[PDB]
Design a protein around this ligand. Structure first.
Ligand SMILES: Nc1ncnc2c1ncn2[C@@H]1O[C@H](COP(=O)(O)OP(=O)(O)OP(=O)(O)O)[C@@H](O)[C@H]1O
Ligand SMILES: Nc1ncnc2c1ncn2[C@@H]1O[C@H](COP(=O)(O)OP(=O)(O)OP(=O)(O)O)[C@@H](O)[C@H]1O
Ligand SMILES: Cn1c(=O)c2c(ncn2C)n(C)c1=O
Ligand SMILES: [Ca+2]
Ligand SMILES: [Zn+2]
Ligand SMILES: [Zn+2]
Lengths: 107, 422, 145, 48
């Protein structure tokens, strides 16, 4: 994550570049496992977060039923919705999708 | 607990079970193609024991319908009861609708939940079992501590919330899909009784092939337009029934040559159903299935009546109904295509566009394989829930604070990272 | 091989008229427009067969006393009561009818089941000739557009 | 054409102000803004 953060935030520098080329074998293991999103963390500009993805959560998210719940959600939101309330609908989806995700783990 | 282990086997295998039940219904009505008047009985262009296999497959199909309603009750009913509990729990806190706002006698679906407040397992699925004292201490200062807090409050038979269970069934029954599967079970039962109308399970080809579902949604999209138009057509038919009654009843003989015991249809309670059954689905208007003038007094008025019936029913109104249905299909397929369009030229979140992420080659696909890629917000939110509170960073505590605040400004409106820099 | 097997029997040597499609480059678009919407059209035709089969179930179980192709019935009257028979009857006759079913069938003239009969007739007319033929037509003309 | 005119009325009654005639998107940098831009700003009843 730290080498990733130095790479992403501070590109174009050959020394870190060479070092990361000597650091290649670890990222390729962990590239599925770290995620990176965008927010605005009170600084009135764009910050970037890095975090960790649990294995079982991802690999039991993507298969069973949640794909159809996803479809349903994407359909309902892109078809219609007020322009500012869409994100709150997304968080409502995210919340009960987490609940469903734990419940699908519970099987 | 082996009961629960067997219960895991259901909901793990729901969709394939439902599809196999459709396969059984195909096979049974394939068999039931062979009937014959005699009391009814089946021949065999098949094996000798096809009637015992019908006796097998009726019971087999009813078994599979009961099997799948158990699987559905223990699969998705917790999610629906979860969404209902969450909505009600938020409306106790942020609204106090049973405390201040008092929803009216309208919206009984929002008024069902008045007798689940003092139930002790109202936080069954809400991850927050302390909603009670929270809304007490947020509000019970004013509206009485005692009244508000009172309003919130065989051994296994003596350890279940009965009133909550009643409310739970009351929210179960209002659901669409549960009502559908219960209907399907009862139709398999009443085909197990009389296998004549056991063929009603052909409806599942609609509910389950996902383009015929759009076809069957297109029969009810334009409801109030279609009902009003059909009522308009009935009014036009009734008015022509008035004219035909009052001036032209001497043209009504279904009988041959009229010396045979001639039947008329000029009555107000008859001529009407005559024009409905005959004149509407005619195609030739009315001038086919009626007497024609051949030099009468009222010949010209007759031809005017014929042509105006032809125009104002068969030319226009049938085309109106057809055009309304095909308009509903055009709009439904346009909505499907618009979903699958703006799922590929926009991000769902930063909402920018495709073209801006294509100065760099292959960029928009990386802009939703790395940048936003909606699964990761789900994952990261799970990550925030599951960690302890005390080890949040500045951003993690910030996002957790905003999410406890419910104010939603950290999602980027039109401000992806690459836009910020040069 | 078709020119060879027309050299044998010149009856079906006429099958080489297909090349007007494959080779005039607008009829090629016409013949591509029969297979553009494959899974939609096949599923819709299957849906129509299901509706016809369900009405065959109703007509079998309640209305087989209206089936006489013969003249006056004292002549050796033929019915269409059998499940497999009534089905192919509604296919060949009722689908391409235009008048729904009330042309090529007995009409009620004061029976018990007269009102149920007219309901059956009107619902057949609507849910086949009004809607579904227009669905097939609109699907093909949509493919052309 | 008649249903298209009905729908166009009910469209440009929701992506424009009737008076300043600007658009919806410009009043959406601020969240919920266009609805405030016709609950406070122009809100045609107030000229009456
Ligand atoms: N914000 C976004 N989130 C997710 N996908 C996006 C977003 N913006 C654009 N896309 C595009 O939408 C597509 C989403 O793919 P899709 O939703 O079909 O997932 P899938 O696994 O292929 O199928 P399913 O729909 O069953 O999940 C991706 O190809 C991506 O390019
Ligand atoms: N300049 C404007 N004046 C009024 N409304 C505007 C204007 N610009 C945009 N709008 C939008 O048009 C809508 C006007 O609402 P509408 O005219 O339907 O009033 P109503 O009371 O809801 O119903 P009615 O049409 O019977 O008055 C509002 O929702 C508002 O968002
Ligand atoms: C404990 N807990 C939470 O605290 C939570 C949640 N979803 C949101 N939060 C905040 N879920 C599903 C949860 O189990
Ligand atoms: Ca700390
Ligand atoms: Zn984005
Ligand atoms: Zn204005």
């Amino acid at each position: 994550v730290l080498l990733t953060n130095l790479s992403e935030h501070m590109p174009n520098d050959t020394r870190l570049q060479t070092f990361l080329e000597l650091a290649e074998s670890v990222l390729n293991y962990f590239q599925p496992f770290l995620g990176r999103i965008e927010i605005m963390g009170s600084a009135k500009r764009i910050e970037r977060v890095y975090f960790e993805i649990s294995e079982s959560s991802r690999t039991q998210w993507e298969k069973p039923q949640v794909k159809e719940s996803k479809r349903q959600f994407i359909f309902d939101v892109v078809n219609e919705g007020g322009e500012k309330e869409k994100m709150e609908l997304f968080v409502n989806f995210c919340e009960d999708t987490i609940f469903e995700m734990q419940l699908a783990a519970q099987i | 607990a082996y009961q629960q282990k067997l219960l895991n086997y259901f909901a793990r295998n729901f969709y394939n079970m439902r599809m196999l039940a459709l396969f059984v219904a195909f096979a049974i009505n394939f068999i039931l193609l062979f009937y014959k008047v005699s009391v009814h009985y089946v021949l065999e262009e098949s094996s000798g024991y096809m009637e015992p296999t019908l006796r097998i497959l009726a019971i087999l199909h009813t078994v599979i319908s009961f099997f799948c309603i158990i699987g559905y009750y223990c699969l998705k009913v917790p999610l629906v009861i979860f969404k209902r509990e969450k909505e009600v729990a938020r409306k106790l806190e942020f609204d106090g609708l049973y405390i201040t706002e008092q929803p009216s006698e309208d919206d009984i679906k929002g008024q069902w939940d008045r007798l689940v407040i003092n139930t002790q397992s109202f936080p069954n699925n809400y991850w927050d079992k302390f909603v009670k004292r929270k809304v007490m201490d947020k509000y019970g200062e004013f509206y009485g501590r005692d009244r508000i807090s009172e309003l919130l409050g065989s051994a296994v038979l003596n350890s279940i919330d009965v009133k909550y269970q009643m409310w739970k069934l009351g929210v179960v029954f209002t659901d669409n899909s549960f009502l559908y599967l219960a209907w399907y079970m009862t139709m398999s039962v009443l085909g197990h009784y009389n296998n004549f109308f056991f063929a009603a399970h052909l409806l599942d080809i609609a509910m389950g092939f996902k383009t015929l579902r759009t076809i069957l949604s297109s029969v009810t999209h334009n409801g109030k337009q279609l009902v009003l138009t059909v009522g308009l057509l009935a009014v036009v038919v009734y008015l022509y029934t008035v004219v035909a009654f009052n001036f032209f009843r001497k043209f009504y003989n279904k009988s041959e040559d009229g010396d045979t015991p001639d039947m008329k249809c000029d009555d107000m309670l008859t001529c009407y159903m005559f024009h409905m059954y005959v004149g509407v689905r005619a195609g030739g208007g009315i001038g086919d299935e009626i007497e024609d003038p051949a030099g009468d007094e009222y010949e010209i008025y007759r031809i005017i009546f014929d042509i105006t019936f032809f125009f104002f029913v068969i030319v226009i109104l049938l085309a109106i109904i057809q055009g309304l249905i095909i308009d509903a299909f055009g709009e439904l397929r346009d909505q499907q295509e618009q979903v699958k369009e703006d799922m590929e030229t926009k991000c769902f979140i930063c909402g920018i566009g495709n073209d801006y992420f294509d100065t760099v080659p292959h960029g928009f696909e990386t802009h939703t394989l790395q940048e936003h890629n909606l699964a990761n917000y789900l994952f990261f939110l799970m990550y925030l829930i599951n960690k302890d509170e005390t080890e949040h960073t500045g951003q993690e505590s910030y996002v957790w604070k905003m999410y406890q605040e419910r104010c939603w400004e950290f999602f980027p409106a039109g401000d992806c990272f690459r836009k910020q820099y040069e």
